[PDB]
Structure 1
């Protein structure tokens, strides 16, 4: 059922989030670094929303480009968090670490940034649909050509597992030529676990 919309297009649309060659004797000693970096960084940067954390390995050290749509929260008073983490990313990843920060201008057209706001609204006890009818039209005044948002879970009920489904525009999924974003962020309410899926469709080719 609906094979993951990145794993079919690694190639014709998108590329990896981490590029580095490794021998067969060190391949599984760089993965375990790069997988507990991403669990570390998102638990620290719970605010100052983060979409993508890329990692390059040049000759013998590192490079990391953390993407936020609000860089001023992370770079606060000239890198009081930047040099503080750069001391302490080396303690998990023994090479010296670079940290680079870009902007995510138009923050309402990347799926991770959108779906983090859905968990925020649905844990403030906002209505399950008034939160989302406004979170699609706002992401259609500027930008995209199609948006699907599925909201599944407890949805407040007693024994209820309904799925909200609202769509606008055009979203293909069996065209490999197209360009689709995808993100699943969850939510822990005072009862039940709500999972949210987002299918922002940018332009094709």
Structure 2
């Protein structure tokens, strides 16, 4: 049947959002949207690229854009001139100042978005292809992670109908909430149709960017302090 995005469930318990700004109802939405406009307006400059992914913040009274590259020398450019052009492209679109951001991707075939995409680019494209997926899986295993699945669809092999193939190595739990992970799903166009790719990577039992709860309050809290009791 159908499944949840691993991740999306997760957000706020194990995984950060994605964008990170405040907003709300009178400005929420919008924002959301600017985002949507950044994404489409910046990402066509990025895509040419080794950027996997972007995250938007927002600080502040600006916009933002953190970019994950992968690579970063290809988006920074000669003496930083680009990152200045990137951003000027932010911004633009957006109504505020914006800033770029850097990020580094990572072990690039670890990811997923960048691994995927690497196989979506080969299928666009197309080349003998197949483979790729095998690989990627090998890779990722490899660079890091405890398992990876890949799946490729749309249709495959040029076709009249639909289709789909997959590979996977290590591992990959599904219901485990938890942790973390990762994930992913990206598409795409070719002269026969849309082509689609999924990737799922299990990192093991490791903690995410957050988590969920904060550390214990009771150490802390302690009863020995003076207060109070409001109220004054």
Give TM-score, length-normalised by structure 1.
Answer: 0.92
Instruction: List aligned pairs for 1:113-192, cutoff 5 A.
Output: 113-192=114-193
SS at match of 2:54: strand
1:23 deviation in Å?
2.5
Q: Distance in 2 between matches of 1:86 and 1:165?
A: 39
Alpha-carbon deviation of 1:188? Answer: 2.4
CA deviation after TM superposition for structure 1 residue 127, in Å: 2.9
Q: Distance in 1 between matches of 2:134 and 2:89?
A: 42
Match of 2:227 in 1: none
Distance 1:143 1:111 in 2: 12
Assess if the C-alpha contact under 8 Å between 1:13 and 1:178 holds in 2.
yes
C-alpha separation in 2, matches of 1:68 and 1:44: 13
Do 2:42 and 2:90's aligned partners in 1 also have CA atoms closer than 8 Å?
no
Deviation at 1:59, TM superposition (A): 3.4
Partners in 2 of 1:23 and 1:198 — Cα distance?
A: 34
Alignment of 1:18 with 2:14, yes or no, is no
Coordinate RMSD, CA, aligned: 1.6
Aligned residue pairs total 205
Moved more, 145-154 or 21-30: 21-30
Q: Work out whether 1:66 is the aligned partner of 2:67.
A: yes
Larger Rg: 2
Q: 1:75 to 1:59 in 2, by over 3 A?
A: closer
Which ranges of structure 1 fall in alignment gaps of 5 or more residues?
A: none
What is the DSSP-based 3-state SS (H/G/I as helix, E as strand, rest coil) of the residue aligned with 1:198? strand
| Distance (whole Å) between structure 2 residues aligned to residue 130 and residue 85 of structure 1 | 36
Aligned twin of 1:201: 202
Quote the Cα distance in structure 1 between the aligned partners of 2:158 and 2:117. Answer: 23
Consecutive aligned runs of 4 or more in structure 1 exceeding 6 Å deviation = none
Answer whether contact 2:148 2:202 (CA < 8 A) is retained: yes
Q: Deviations over 1:1-52 (max 9, x none)?
A: 1112222111232110111111321111111111110112221111222222
Counterpart for residue 4 of structure 1: 5
Q: Which residue of the partner structure matches residue 38 of structure 1?
A: 39
After superposition, give the CA deviation of every residue in 1:115-152 in whole Å (9 maximum; x if it has no partner): 11111111232234311111111111120111111111
Once residues 135 and 36 of structure 2 are traced to their aligned partners in structure 1, the CA distance between those partners, rounded to angstroms, is 35
Check whether the contact 2:112–2:199 (CA below 8 A) recurs between aligned residues. Answer: yes
Provide TM-score, normalisation by structure 2. 0.82
Displacement of 1:97 in angstroms is 0.9
> Contact 1:64–1:100 (CA<8 Å) still a contact in 2?
yes
